[PDB]
Every structure is written in C-alpha cells, then in structure tokens.
C-alpha cells in the first residue's frame, strides 16, 4: 500500500551510524553512506506490507492494538494515531510489567478512572485545598501514564512499537505472554524478539508519522470489514 518513493521522501532509508549498528540487522542493511547505514527499501517494503496485512486481519477479528512510543519526539503522533482508529497507546514511559503484571496495573487503571469520575461527574467541589492539589497531581500522573490503555479492559491482542531497542521491556513482556509484536527496527536495534520486524528509521519524525498513518488506516479498514 505504502509506496517506496514516499518512504524515501520521509527518510526511512536512513539508518544509524556504522559504529552503533547490530549485526543481526545486516540483512536489512543495503549500504553505508557517509559512514551512516542505509536500510534496504527493497527488502523493507514487502515486509511492511505484510505487517500491515496482519494488522488488518487482527482488526477484522476485533483485536486490541497497543501503540507504543516513548521517544518524546513522536509521543504526540503516536497518541494521535491511536485515537484516529480508537485504539490504545502508551506514549509515555512504559510501566515495567504493564502486561505481565496486568492485574496490579488494572487496579491502577481503576483508581485513575475513579479519580476522573470524581473530577468530572461528581461536581462536588469543596475540597481542602492541599488535598485537592494532591488529587489533581495524582490525576495528572495517572493520565500521563495510563491514559490510552484505560478503556482497554484486558490484554492487547497485538503490539505495535516504534523502537525495539527503546521499548525492549514491552517487547519482552509481549514475548513472555505471546502477544504478536509489530516493530519498527533501526539498524542499532535488536529484532530477534520481534515477530513482524520493520526496518525503518525510528528516529526521524516524518518517517515515524508515515509508519503510524499507514498502520492506522489498515486498522480502520479491518474494523470496517
């Protein structure tokens, strides 16, 4: 679906330096330009298409998708992408054992929900000032951490990730549980834990956005189906 020219324009083909690479990525590398690795788009495209198809299929059976990016450059964009297809996301720091230790985090979700309710639906005001400030702070914290995944209920049925090396904790959790993983994997990253790897520039903003947008479109399609 996504063309090669567009990817080139975005800056997918660019990959990390030649001292920071991973030799497991050697297949996915094409050459090294100005002492910077270039990702082979010929090999990237078909697999990206595949990954998209799998994501669509997951959607069709009413699968839950989780969008992970905590790079703080593309946090805004990943949240936007998640919302477009009304799926779930973790745009800020992934809590260690979010999925493996769901049952605990589920309480966390519940507390957040209760606090939200108090804030909005109660309309009770009349709270001791310091106490009110503390509750507000707690709300902000919990919104930041678990805002996207609050309506999730249980465990996702697939996991899209923007950087493998950066989100290796989430990847490891998904593997332990067996959730399918759909990772954008730059040259420095480790793709062994990934099921549906995606060789692309995790760093560049436009490339990240492109990745996200195609993923969102195919999720929406699967939902429509």
């Amino acid at each position: 679906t996504v063309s090669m020219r567009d990817m080139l324009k975005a800056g997918v083909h660019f990959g990390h330096q030649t001292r920071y690479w991973n030799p497991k990525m050697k297949p996915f590398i094409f050459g090294a330009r100005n002492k910077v690795h270039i990702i082979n788009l010929e090999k990237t495209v078909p697999m990206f298409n595949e990954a998209l198809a799998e994501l669509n299929k997951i959607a069709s059976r009413k699968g839950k998708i989780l969008f992970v990016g905590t790079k703080r450059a593309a946090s805004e964009a990943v949240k936007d992408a998640a919302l477009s297809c009304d799926q779930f996301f973790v745009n800020h720091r992934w809590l260690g054992g979010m999925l493996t230790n769901w049952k605990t985090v589920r309480q966390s979700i519940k507390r957040l929900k209760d606090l939200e309710t108090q804030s909005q639906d109660g309309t009770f005001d009349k709270l001791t000032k310091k106490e009110a400030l503390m509750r507000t702070r707690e709300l902000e914290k919990l919104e930041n951490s678990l805002g996207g995944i609050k309506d999730m209920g249980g465990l996702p049925d697939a996991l899209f990730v923007i950087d493998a090396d950066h989100e290796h904790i989430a990847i490891k959790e998904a593997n332990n549980l067996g959730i399918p993983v759909f990772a954008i994997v730059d040259t420095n990253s480790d793709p062994d834990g990934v099921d549906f790897v995606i060789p692309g520039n995790d760093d560049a903003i436009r490339a990240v956005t492109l990745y996200l947008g195609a993923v969102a479109a195919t999720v929406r399609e699967g939902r429509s189906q």
Binding site: W102, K103, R106, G153
Partner: peptide, 8 residues
C-alpha cells in the same frame, strides 16, 4: 479471568 488471564 478477573485479572485479564482467561480470555472469555
């Protein structure tokens, strides 16, 4: 099941 471990 309550702690999302038994997909029902």
């Amino acid at each position: 099941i309550g702690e999302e471990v038994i997909e029902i």
